[PDB]
């Protein structure tokens, strides 16, 4: 139930002449590959991005993908030629192909296609098919593309066989990076809340890995209920940032502490009290002309 391998493709078609395709690959939440319109070859982003695969095993895939890219571009352009009143430029296609990893190689595979931001077509079993809620005009292009059994045989190999085989290789080749532990660093803050005579207390938490984290404002053991957890925000160095905020009246701040629990911290939870020796000092290094 652990990991999910994703090959994310994004294609833009503005006019007949102008088009581009950019692709990124994610294992868990770590980027493994990068490939852009200008780059003829797929670039590695980790020292273990090739996995267990040979130089030739890899070159088979890269050549098969290079051939696919230019084939995909021209095939979309011809589909717009075919679909004249029904669909027209500009076109945005998003492909999400990969395989979810489990114990004992359960390795579920998926190939999901979005069109103009909406999920429409799924490869399944042996063939393409439109999902519930798809535009009706897609029925014909799917038939046209399903007539190619050669493409189908290649995709079925990629999903059923080549996907799980490749990613297991990555799961070992990059075992160190996947299982690494990075410690969160917390610092307190506050802004005036919308209501007059109220303060919004902010607890920043930055630089932690893996992604599971526990952040709650507290007054002793009693957990403070009005704590609002933010959305996980990515740092450039493959680490995570999160802020948790509590809202209170002015003067009610004393006694409060931002508690943070993380896997990297061992048993030692970061308990950071509001008016601490360190908060006083760290706050003085922050002052500015609001």
């Amino acid at each position: 139930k652990n990991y999910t391998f994703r090959c994310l493709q994004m294609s833009s078609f503005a006019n007949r002449s102008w088009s581009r395709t950019d692709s990124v690959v994610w294992l868990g939440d770590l980027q493994t590959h990068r490939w852009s319109n200008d780059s003829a070859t797929i670039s590695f982003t980790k020292p273990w991005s090739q996995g267990k695969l040979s130089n030739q095993q890899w070159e088979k895939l890269q050549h098969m993908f290079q051939v696919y890219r230019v084939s995909f571009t021209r095939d979309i352009q011809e589909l717009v030629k075919m679909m004249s009143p029904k669909e027209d430029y500009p076109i945005e296609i998003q492909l999400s192909a990969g395989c979810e990893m489990y114990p004992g190689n359960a390795s579920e595979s998926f190939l999901h296609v979005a069109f103009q931001g909406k999920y429409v077509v799924r490869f399944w079993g042996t063939s393409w098919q439109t999902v519930p809620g798809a535009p009706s005009w897609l029925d014909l292009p799917i038939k046209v593309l399903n007539a190619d059994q050669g493409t189908s045989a290649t995709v079925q190999m990629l999903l059923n066989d080549t996907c799980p085989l490749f990613v297991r290789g990555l799961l070992e080749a990059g075992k160190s990076d996947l299982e690494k532990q990075e410690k969160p660093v917390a610092w307190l803050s506050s802004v005036p809340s919308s209501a007059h005579g109220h303060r919004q207390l902010v607890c920043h938490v930055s630089g932690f890995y893996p992604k599971p984290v526990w952040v709650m404002w507290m007054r002793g053991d009693q957990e403070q209920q009005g704590t609002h957890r933010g959305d996980f925000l990515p740092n450039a160095d493959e680490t995570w940032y999160l802020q948790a905020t509590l809202d209170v009246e002015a003067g009610e701040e004393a006694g409060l502490a931002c508690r943070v629990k993380h896997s990297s911290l061992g048993g030692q939870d970061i308990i950071l009290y509001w008016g601490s020796l360190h908060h006083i000092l760290d706050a003085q290094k922050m002052v500015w002309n609001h």
Partner: T-cell receptor
Amino acid sequence: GGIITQTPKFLIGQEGQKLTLKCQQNFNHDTMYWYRQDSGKGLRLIYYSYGAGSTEKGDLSEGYDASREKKSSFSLTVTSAQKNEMAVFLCASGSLLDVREVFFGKGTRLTVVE
Amino acid sequence: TQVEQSPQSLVVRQGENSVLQCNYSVTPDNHLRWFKQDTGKGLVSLTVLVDQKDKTSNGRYSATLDKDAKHSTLHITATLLDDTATYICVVGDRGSALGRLHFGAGTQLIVIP
């Protein structure tokens, strides 16, 4: 079941004269093509269609235009005939659900006379 | 070009066997097919080859496709006078109606009685 026919079989034209070639077809084919066979050269695509209405440019699209009136009918136009132009034009129809199923007409031989 | 046929002109005795060659560069290479064209006539389909290494025979016409070598061969068994035509080798680059055909220059076969 059916035949892909193109009329006329032979065409007598003049320099600068606007020329038209027609192509009727019985199969329920959506895709239709126009080729020109140059002596000692392979066929080159001029215009093709998916129905309507549809006229997509090929590789020898310059000098010609084309129009598709019906599913059956597909017409090619020669804007201005080169003075000494002697060429064969070929019409082909194809299936949209089977790329292998392609049928060709008997051809059209042109002589531009002055 | 992208599809070469060799030789340009071939001559065989009436009754013999004749061999026609076709090399290509086109990618991808979904299928390869052969056409017979008489003088002042259209193109007639003889054989369609689909597989990696494929063999198809239709009447006296027979063909072998080698996708790895990007090479194909047409055989005519017991050559007749009626086979004094042009033979065209065409390759389709996709397995759907979206693909385009690539036409070889052709080979004139002349049959000596």
